[PDB]
Amino acid sequence: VYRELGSIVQELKESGDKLEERLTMLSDVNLLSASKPRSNIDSKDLTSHR
Amino acid sequence: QNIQEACLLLDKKQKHIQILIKGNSSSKSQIRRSSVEAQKYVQDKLLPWPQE
């Protein structure tokens, strides 16, 4: 009984960890919709600087 | 000779009775220990799982 419950807890834990990882990824600011273009030209935008 | 042998036979039966008596007293203690071990396993290892 102890081995069986142990397996169920592990499966739930692995699923829980994977979900947290995905949520963290989806909350990345660069992925989030059309923030109003930045008013300042990004240092990485070489064309606008030129 | 028979009396001696049978005296020795009685000695053997008595020595065995002593061993059995000692053996049965030890078994009684072991059963008590096994009962405590099983209860301790349920309390320490199984009862905490529902919370996890």
CB contact under 8 A, A2 and B49: yes
Q: Is the CB of A3 inside 8 Å of chain B's CB atoms?
A: no
For A3, counting Cβ atoms within 10 Å of its Cβ (0-12 exposed, 13-18 middle, 19+ buried), the class is: exposed
Measured between CA atoms, the residue of chain B closest to residue A6 is: B49
Q: Residue with structure tokens 């059309």? A: A34
What number of CA atoms fall less than 13 Å from residue A17's CA on the CB side?
A: 6
Q: Is the CB of A9 inside 8 Å of chain B's CB atoms?
A: yes
Please give the method by which this entry was determined.
cryo-EM
Give dist(CA B38, CA A46) in Å, integer: 73
Measured between CA atoms, the residue of chain A closest to residue B45 is: A2
For A42, phi then psi, to 5°, come to -60, 140
Q: Residue with structure tokens 């919370």? A: B51
